[PDB]
Ligand binder design. Structure first.
Ligand SMILES: Nc1nc2c(ncn2[C@@H]2O[C@H](COP(=O)(O)OP(=O)(O)CP(=O)(O)O)[C@@H](O)[C@H]2O)c(=O)[nH]1
Lengths: 570, 122, 59, 99
RNA sequence: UGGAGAGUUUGAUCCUGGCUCAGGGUGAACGCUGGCGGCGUGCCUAAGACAUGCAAGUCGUGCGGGCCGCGGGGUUUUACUCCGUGGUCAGCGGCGGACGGGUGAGUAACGCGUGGGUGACCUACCCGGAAGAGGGGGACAACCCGGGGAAACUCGGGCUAAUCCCCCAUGUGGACCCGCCCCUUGGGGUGUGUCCAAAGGGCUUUGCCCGCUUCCGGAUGGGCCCGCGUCCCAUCAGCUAGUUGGUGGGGUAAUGGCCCACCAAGGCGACGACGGGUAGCCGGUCUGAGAGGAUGGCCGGCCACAGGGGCACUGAGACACGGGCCCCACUCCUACGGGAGGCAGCAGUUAGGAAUCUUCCGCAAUGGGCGCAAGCCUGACGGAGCGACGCCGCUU
RNA sequence: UAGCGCCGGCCAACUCCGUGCCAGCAGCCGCGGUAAUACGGAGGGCGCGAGCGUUACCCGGAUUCACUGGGCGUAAAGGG
């Protein structure tokens, strides 16, 4: 837009779950666009239409404004603000500490929440300006003052402006705009420098050249040129950036020194986990960029064999190997959660392998739940662990410290940050797999889904676990049993053991498949000829009653197999 | 027009032009298989390699070969009885279906996209 | 399985030309190390080429 | 999308009229002579034979018809004229035959 | 004028033979590494798909407008009809849309080889040649208008040009039937009667300049019909009803059952069919003393298809890979009435599968097409892009 | 910017400690069960060379398809 050095900015409208993070920048911005009967409809911004199922926008890319200022800066500031709710934040964090400041109107209904506090914890490490703006036309029933002032007592922010622009139509940021330039800082648009420019969101090549839209924070760039970022970057000439327009690629020269231009060309499908970690762009001797890019952990006959559909966003599970007696099926897929349903298995929830150290010195020996039956006295399983290091609001520890003992929890070292408010810092070591079941869902409920967590594991040497098995007339059954730790023997007994009944019965023998976990059994899971000689003989009845009765003793014995496995595994 | 099981024409994604029916899909008692309806049924005839293969399926009406009425009393008969096929709740497997314009079809208005896909002659 | 490095299970994609292992009938195929998810023994300093492994930097 | 040569087709479409009907006419006229050939009205058949000549070279005027085949039509038709003049024809004009 | 071996049996030895190695090499390949330069070269596995851009025209020195300009005016104004037209979009009319780019599937056969046959032919534009070159009438696009339509388009009526068609002259002559001479299966010459000819425009105004025309000369191209050559299976041993010939006819650049009716009764087959498997094929390349064998992609030759299948049309010349018509699968688009399309062209994406390529750069010459010339196009080609992928040289 | 393979014998070029009927490589015979020249480790030599093994195929070699150039009584087979 000719807008040389100076001007521009960095603002984002981030908020909690379901808050219309796509309302403000919807349209009617005077900029003139999106129309002709084919308006961007409800929840514009490309997206994928597929989300139409529930307008569950994944991320916010492109969408930049031009003219709209009563003869001023004209147009100089980003407009990217991925939505969601603690479902892509961490992973999408790459955009968090990217653009200074972040707008977002508080929900007149639910109002402020966890996503608010945690969302702010990032608006600091980067350095942005707070933006409190309560949207929603107050709706039929709802308070505008109380609700507004509310986020002023807890958030600690006072009448820092906002304006009830109202969610549905209403004002429509009819104030923030002319205020944005006034209520925002500058990102400095140096005419030239050694091209500082950290990698942004991945965008496939569509059919030729990926979309690594960058942002010359301090320098200039053109089209069809060279590039080099840390990992050298084996690339060459590339098309000039057109900017995140509304439709197909645009024209015009490349971006500027801080603008929001996408880097096309140079790369063609050549996918090699080269997500990036810096400006990627080259031209001189510019120190690396603020390593402000990274996600975190996972939190939670073919088919594919390479779900490389987009490793860039992939939670964390390259399928690995997984040694499951059953049909293995889905592997390391219980981490992503909430997210699923692709196109063309069974989520066995957890699948921890652990590390075994058989006596006589046999190292890990490839730990597993079916790797070499028990030949010698186990060495007490033994494995690692994970400490507790995740902030929290108010006094939610009561529910944590209680449920935390899910596995002989050990108060690593309770703490209480100062200056804050209620936010605490509890700590407790535990296992890996265990923290994968009946934890996530609880992690939120227990504290109302407030604050997250992050550890590195820890713990070894001892640690009960045993090896709870099962029984089923036959023997060995399918392939269950693992390590019943902490009375965990019967804990799941009346659960998994009582596997309904294998759906299939097969014959009328009624075999009693118990649970030979390691006892001492634990779990506790025919023709009608008899009545035909009617009206008499509690004698002859018995005669024909023994006939079949003898078969049972000669059936279950001779009738080998009787194993109807491969049912549902539940 | 109406049918429990029967020979009824599929003309769809079967590898041959027939499906055996099973029955009406909604009202318990109904007997009658009214048009503008989805149905349970199965092919009996063969396929060229194809995809859908043998098994069971739920899916919908085309035509009648037994007296319709319109509210505007438009009328239209046809000594033949093709009917629609569907995957899941709703969407149409084959992206191909030769057939004509016709009237009652869209009127359930649960599956508008189909209309385009069977417009033509014969 | 040529080599000294046990690996892989009920399934493991790799690839294979073969070569006589004039010891047992019909079997005729020595899959090379490190290709795909099959691994490769190390320590076996010279003759890394077959039983593929890159050269360690004298370490 | 707008390759333009559709030209030839549509243009040639008027042609597919042209000659074709013209060619067709030759048949009719020919057999009329042949029709006439049955009945001793040879003078008639040869006046029409004349007309046949005319259509022949009308075809000749451009890219229509000729080769030997035009003369196939000629020599055939007139040959028929001659075999039925054999049928007690007692022939009239040389306008339909070399003297 | 070019032809190396050894080894392994059994207590030992020698034969018959089997095993595998020493030779080289090919569109390759994991493995390690990996400096450059030069050259060569890269879909042989679903003949699946395939998105966006791009592969064939330019003619106003053919013809008439719409369309913007140039300036004068024909014109006082209000203006616009116009003088050059400068251009320009479309259209009409011209010649190219068959040659180039592809890959080689299916076919074993006269398709190709190789040679003849062409006494059963044809050539657009080639030079050489005899030339020849009048009157007359008539339609179409757009234009006007109505008519349907989200658009595109679709529909009637009315006008209008001309190298467009028709109109009868006009014949240096050409075509056939019958008759001839001279060679004798539709050879070459004479015989009467019919039949038959066809714009001008460009320029410097009478000459030029391009064309227009029948006929001839050969050039050139193609065509068919045969000689011979042309892959493995005889646990495929008899099969063939346009199947085999005759009449006569039919249509065809040209014969022939190519087709029909009819007359006849066959007709081929152990020299190897009727089958089955398997395959563009020859240039060739590779092996190798030779004999010889194997293979046949990049380079050349035709056929072959050029979504599957088929049929014709124009037309100098086809069964038409960036055409028509229709079925058969498929595609995406629709405003839901309808559409519109075919990357085995380019470049390039997915699926494939071990495996394979820059959404280059360019009109420069070389090549074609136009055009009287300027001019103008072409992922032909060009060089460059990248894979020690091969190959030659190259330092470490 | 120097590296890969190679070393019983064929068909080139040595030992060494490890190992100790395992773990083994292997054109071909196979070579090794507590002193292994083939197995690990070094070191050396050898080989070619920025390319070395690498299978696959191709024919050669090989007279192991034979017209040139063969054999077929007991070795494979003469038809009753
Ligand atoms: N009654 C009402 N509805 C509102 C208001 N503001 C937004 N909405 C509605 O709620 C819907 C969701 O709001 P929005 O935040 O923009 O979408 P989203 O919550 O971000 C969904 P995603 O996170 O996937 O992008 C919107 O489709 C909009 O129609 C409001 O003030 N009142």
């Amino acid at each position: 837009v000719r807008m040389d050095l100076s001007r521009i900015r960095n603002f984002s409208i981030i908020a909690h779950v379901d808050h219309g993070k796509s309302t403000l920048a919807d349209r009617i911005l005077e900029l003139t666009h999106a129309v002709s009967d084919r308006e961007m409809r409800e929840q514009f911004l490309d997206s994928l239409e597929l989300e139409r199922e529930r307008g569950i926008t994944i991320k916010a890319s492109a969408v930049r404004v031009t003219y709209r200022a009563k003869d001023g800066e004209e147009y100089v500031f980003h407009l990217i603000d991925t939505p969601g709710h603690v479902d892509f934040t961490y992973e999408v964090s790459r955009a968090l500490a990217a653009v200074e400041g972040v707008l977002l109107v508080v929900d007149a209904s639910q109002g402020v929440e966890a996503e608010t506090l945690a969302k702010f914890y990032m608006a600091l490490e980067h350095g942005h300006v707070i933006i409190p703006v309560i949207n929603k036309i107050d709706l039929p029933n709802a308070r505008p003052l109380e609700v507004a002032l509310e986020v002023e007592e807890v958030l600690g922010l006072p009448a820092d402006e906002a304006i009830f622009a109202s969610g549905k139509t209403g004002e429509g940021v009819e104030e923030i705009l002319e205020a944005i330039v006034q209520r925002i800082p500058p990102p400095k648009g140096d005419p030239e420098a050694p091209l500082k420019a950290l990698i942004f969101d991945s965008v496939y090549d569509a059919y030729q050249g990926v979309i690594p839209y960058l942002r010359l924070f301090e320098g200039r760039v053109r089209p069809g040129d060279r590039i080099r970022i840390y990992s050298t970057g084996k690339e060459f000439t590339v098309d000039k950036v057109g900017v995140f327009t509304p439709q197909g690629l645009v024209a015009t020269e490349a971006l500027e020194a801080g603008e929001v231009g996408w880097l096309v060309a140079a790369i063609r499908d050549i996918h090699d986990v080269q997500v990036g970690d810096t400006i990627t762009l080259a031209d001189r001797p510019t120190p690396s960029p603020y390593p402000g890019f990274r996600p975190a952990k996972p939190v939670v006959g073919k088919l594919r064999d390479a779900l490389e559909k987009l490793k860039l966003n992939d939670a964390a599970l390259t399928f690995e190997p997984e040694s499951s007696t059953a049909l293995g099926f889905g592997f390391r897929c219980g981490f992503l959660g909430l997210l699923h349903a692709e196109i063309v298995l069974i989520a066995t929830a957890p699948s921890v392998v652990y590390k075994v150290r058989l006596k006589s010195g046999e190292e890990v020996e490839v730990h597993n739940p079916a790797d070499l039956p028990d030949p010698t006295r186990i060495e007490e399983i033994l494995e690692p662990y994970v400490k507790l290091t995740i902030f929290t609001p108010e006094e939610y520890v009561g529910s944590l410290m209680q449920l935390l003992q899910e596995k002989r929890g050990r108060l690593v070292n309770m703490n209480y940050l100062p200056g804050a408010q209620k936010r605490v810092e509890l700590v407790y070591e535990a296992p890996f797999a265990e923290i994968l079941y009946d934890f996530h869902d609880r992690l939120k409920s227990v504290s109302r889904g407030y604050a997250s967590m992050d550890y590195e594991q820890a713990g070894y040497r001892p640690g009960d676990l045993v090896k709870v098995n099962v029984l089923v007339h036959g023997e060995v059954v399918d392939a269950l049993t693992f390590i019943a730790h902490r009375e965990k023997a019967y804990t799941m007994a009346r659960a998994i053991v009582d596997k309904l009944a294998e759906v299939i019965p097969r014959q009328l023998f009624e075999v009693p498949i118990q649970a030979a976990i390691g006892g001492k059994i634990i779990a506790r899971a025919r023709k009608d000829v008899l009545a035909k000689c009617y009206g008499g003989d509690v004698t002859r009845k018995k005669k024909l009653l023994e006939k079949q009765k003898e078969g049972k003793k000669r059936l279950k014995a001779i009738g080998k197999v009787e194993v109807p496995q491969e049912a549902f595994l539940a | 027009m109406i049918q429990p099981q029967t020979y009824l024409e599929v003309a769809d994604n079967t590898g041959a032009r027939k499906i055996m029916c099973i029955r009406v899909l909604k009202g318990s008692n109904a007997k009658y298989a009214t048009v503008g309806d989805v149905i349970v049924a199965s092919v009996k005839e063969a396929i060229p390699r194809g995809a859908v293969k043998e098994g069971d399926v739920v899916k919908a009406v085309v035509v009648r070969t037994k007296k319709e009425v319109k509210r505007p009393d438009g009328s239209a008969i046809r000594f033949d009885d093709n009917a629609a096929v569907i995957i899941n709740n709703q969407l149409e497997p084959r992206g191909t279906r030769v057939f004509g314009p016709v009237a009652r079809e869209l009127r359930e208005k649960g599956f508008m996209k189909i209309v385009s896909l069977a417009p033509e002659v014969l | 399985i040529p080599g000294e490095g046990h690996n892989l299970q009920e399934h493991s994609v790799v690839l294979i030309r073969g070569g006589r292992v004039k010891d047992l009938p019909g079997v005729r195929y020595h899959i090379v190390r490190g290709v795909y998810d099959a691994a490769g023994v190390k320590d076996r300093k010279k003759s890394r080429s077959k039983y593929g492994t890159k050269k360690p930097k004298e370490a | 999308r707008n390759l333009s040569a559709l030209k030839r087709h549509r243009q040639s479409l008027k042609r597919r009229l042209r000659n074709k009907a013209k060619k067709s006419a030759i048949k009719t006229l020919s057999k009329k002579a042949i029709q006439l050939a049955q009945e001793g009205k040879a003078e008639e058949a040869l006046k029409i034979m004349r007309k046949a000549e005319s259509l022949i070279d009308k075809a000749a005027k451009g890219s229509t018809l000729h080769k030997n085949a035009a003369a196939r039509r000629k020599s055939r038709l007139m040959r028929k004229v001659r075999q039925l003049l054999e049928a007690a024809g007692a022939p009239l004009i040389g306008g339909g035959l070399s003297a």
